[PDB]
Structure formats: structure tokens, C-alpha cells
Amino acid sequence: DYDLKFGMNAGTSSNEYKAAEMFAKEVKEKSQGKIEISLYPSSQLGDDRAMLKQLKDGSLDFTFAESARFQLFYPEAAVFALPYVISNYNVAQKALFDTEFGKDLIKKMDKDLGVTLLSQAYNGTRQTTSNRAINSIADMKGLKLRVPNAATNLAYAKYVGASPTPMAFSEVYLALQTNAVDGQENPLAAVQAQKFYEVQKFLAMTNHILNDQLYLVSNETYKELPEDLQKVVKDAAENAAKYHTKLFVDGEKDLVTFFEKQGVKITHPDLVPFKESMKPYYAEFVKQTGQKGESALKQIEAIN
Ligand SMILES: [Zn+2]
């Protein structure tokens, strides 16, 4: 029998975990018991980068990773988290699987990083909560928008006309409550997790950054497996991914609905001038990441 480990940063109550449970179920049934995958949630084995390294050395069998996270190896890969570059999840898939940039990055993942990409999932979009309504981009002006201390997030707050306000995540509730800070952005699960709906009366569907999740196997594991058991593992991660995606899609819907119950009001501002405002940031991406950057941007922009 094959005794396989699967690590991930997410927790037992997460969509990522519920879905890896499925993947593990199916690999056990359909390998007629030969393979069995244990779960190591909550960064138990290290952070993402350590788990990625462990996939390369073969000491961890599976792990999760966003596609933007690969910019640690290839800087042009941060294209995936550039604000308004990935309009939707259909863009994230065609970007990864149906472009020369993305086809090639999967080939790099393998050749350089010892990692086989089995499947991709949707892991949620970042949206914007505030003490007052965002009906358009003209509302962004004046807002103390809390972002984490990450270039793409600050570039979002900055270029839309907001006032970016990095602060520690645990300080964010009271900052919002006492209106020291006006809004924040983050996936909807954080809004709920951190109770921001209590201190934020408005939620804007700003669709500004989108997160994905890759089902990754160690090359040392995958190719030591027999051809039939490889396909069992691959099929199961394509099934698990479709589920994972549907968990996030369906749960985002229910969370909008939940928030409305809490007295939050939702807006759907026009995002054409939001993405127009980013062109200065894109210029700076292509400057830093050069020719590889420019074609990634242009090939992904060329999508739907
Ligand atoms: Zn065993």
C-alpha cells in the first residue's frame, strides 16, 4: 500500500479541506485500497513554500498553491493577482491552461519545481466593505481602505483613488468600528470570520483580486505510481476541484445573503473605470517583469 500525506495551509472547517477529504475518499476507493492520503491542515508541515519544497524533495505527497504564488519563482506570474486582470474564474482557467504563458508555467512547475499540476479550483474573490456605500469609483476617493502589506493590494487601494492603510489583521475590527479606518478588502469568508459585517454596513462587489487553488502532486510520488493509479489520482483531483469550486461559488452566494440578514447593503459598482485606473500599475509590472511580463498580460487580456 501507498501511505500518502497531503498538507495545506487551510483548516478542517475549510472548503479546501472538505474537498481534499473527497479527493482522499476517491483515491482510496478507486485504487481498491492501495493508496490512502492523510490530511495535514493548518500549516502543520510548514507554510506553502516549505510544502512546495517538500513536494520537490518527495517528502510530502500533495499540497495546495495559488497560481499567483508562483511569482516567487517567476515574477511575471504575479499577473494572476494583478487587480482586474482576472475578471472572473473563466479567465483564471483559460489564463493557466489556454495561453502560451500558462501552458509554459505548468511546464516550469514540473521541470524546475518537481511538481505535477493535477487540477485547478476557484478559491474566492476579494470584495470591499465600507462604512459608506461604494456606488462608483468616485466613492473610492477619501476612503481609508485597509489592505494587507502586499504590493497588489496596496496597488488596488492606491490606483482606484483610495487611501491605502496597511495595518495588522487583528487590529482591523476596532479600526472599522470607531471609523479610524473606513473599509477593508478580503474574501467574504474573512468578513464573516472576523465579524466585519457587524462594523461594516456596506459591501461592494469590486471583483478586484481572484484566488485559485492548485491540486499538486510530487513528481517523485506521481511517476513512481503505476499508470492506472496515476489516472485514479488525476481523475479524483479533477472531481475534487469541480467540488472545491462549487463550494466557493455556492458559499459566496450564501454569504452575500447572510450579510444582508445582518443589515449590510450590497453594491455592484461599475468596474470599467476600476480596471482603467490600474493601467499605471500594469505598466510597472511589465517594467519590472520585462518581456515575459508583457506577453503574459497581453495573452491573458486577450481572453474572453
Ligand atoms: Zn500502509
Side-chain angles (χ1 to χ4, degrees), residues 1-28 30-48 50-52 54-55 57-99 101-143 145-173 175-219 221-226 228-245 247-287 289-297 299-304:
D1 99 338
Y2 301 83
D3 289 312
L4 307 181
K5 297 150 207 59
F6 189 152
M8 65 182 73
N9 288 329
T12 58
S13 297
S14 70
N15 294 339
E16 301 89 319
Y17 184 94
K18 289 196 190 64
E21 280 196 292
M22 178 181 179
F23 170 61
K25 259 273 276 99
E26 194 185 313
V27 173
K28 204 172 155 161
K30 288 180 182 158
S31 59
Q32 305 305 297
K34 275 216 155 110
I35 301 162
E36 187 184 300
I37 298 148
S38 290
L39 301 190
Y40 295 72
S42 284
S43 286
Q44 269 180 193
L45 304 155
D47 72 323
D48 57 52
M51 288 183 279
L52 270 167
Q54 295 162 27
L55 283 226
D57 82 10
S59 72
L60 177 61
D61 299 287
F62 302 87
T63 204
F64 278 134
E66 306 210 2
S67 298
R69 189 53 180 172
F70 287 90
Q71 75 191 268
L72 275 18
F73 304 109
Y74 321 105
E76 70 269 20
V79 70
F80 282 112
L82 254 14
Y84 296 93
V85 162
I86 310 285
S87 306
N88 62 42
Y89 174 62
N90 174 239
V91 176
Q93 302 189 284
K94 303 245 195 275
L96 185 62
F97 293 109
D98 298 333
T99 48
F101 160 66
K103 287 188 206 93
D104 183 77
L105 194 211
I106 295 166
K107 265 170 279 197
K108 281 166 145 164
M109 234 150 145
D110 180 13
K111 301 156 153 197
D112 305 2
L113 312 174
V115 149
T116 298
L117 180 40
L118 297 167
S119 58
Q120 168 178 46
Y122 176 65
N123 216 77
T125 313
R126 295 179 83 91
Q127 314 294 0
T128 310
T129 66
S130 42
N131 58 22
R132 65 177 166 78
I134 307 156
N135 284 98
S136 72
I137 200 160
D139 304 312
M140 292 312 288
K141 196 171 172 44
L143 198 88
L145 189 63
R146 133 79 193 184
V147 284
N149 208 133
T152 202
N153 301 279
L154 295 148
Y156 169 56
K158 173 169 189 192
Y159 289 99
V160 298
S163 313
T165 301
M167 80 180 341
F169 189 51
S170 63
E171 300 184 332
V172 172
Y173 182 100
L176 296 183
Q177 187 179 201
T178 69
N179 303 112
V181 179
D182 290 308
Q184 64 85 55
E185 111 266 325
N186 255 131
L188 304 187
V191 177
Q192 174 192 51
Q194 291 315 131
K195 277 191 155 51
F196 289 158
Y197 58 82
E198 287 183 342
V199 290
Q200 301 280 67
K201 279 313 95 164
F202 297 96
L203 177 62
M205 299 307 153
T206 57
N207 292 335
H208 60 273
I209 296 148
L210 186 143
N211 316 129
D212 74 327
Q213 213 75 340
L214 308 179
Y215 289 75
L216 306 174
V217 62
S218 180
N219 289 9
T221 296
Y222 193 71
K223 308 184 192 176
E224 265 279 323
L225 290 174
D228 68 316
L229 258 26
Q230 284 177 5
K231 192 198 169 283
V232 163
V233 168
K234 167 81 185 181
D235 284 350
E238 297 281 32
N239 290 141
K242 283 166 184 91
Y243 181 63
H244 190 305
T245 290
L247 285 183
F248 277 91
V249 169
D250 285 343
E252 282 184 305
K253 268 153 187 77
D254 294 338
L255 269 176
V256 170
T257 295
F258 175 84
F259 300 150
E260 280 184 342
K261 230 184 140 177
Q262 311 302 299
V264 182
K265 305 279 179 265
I266 316 307
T267 59
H268 310 88
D270 183 356
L271 310 179
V272 170
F274 274 77
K275 191 213 170 83
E276 181 69 26
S277 73
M278 295 313 317
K279 295 210 294 215
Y281 191 47
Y282 300 159
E284 197 182 289
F285 165 77
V286 43
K287 170 180 201 239
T289 61
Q291 212 78 2
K292 292 202 282 303
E294 197 164 47
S295 28
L297 228 222
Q299 288 158 27
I300 294 168
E301 280 182 327
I303 282 179
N304 69 358

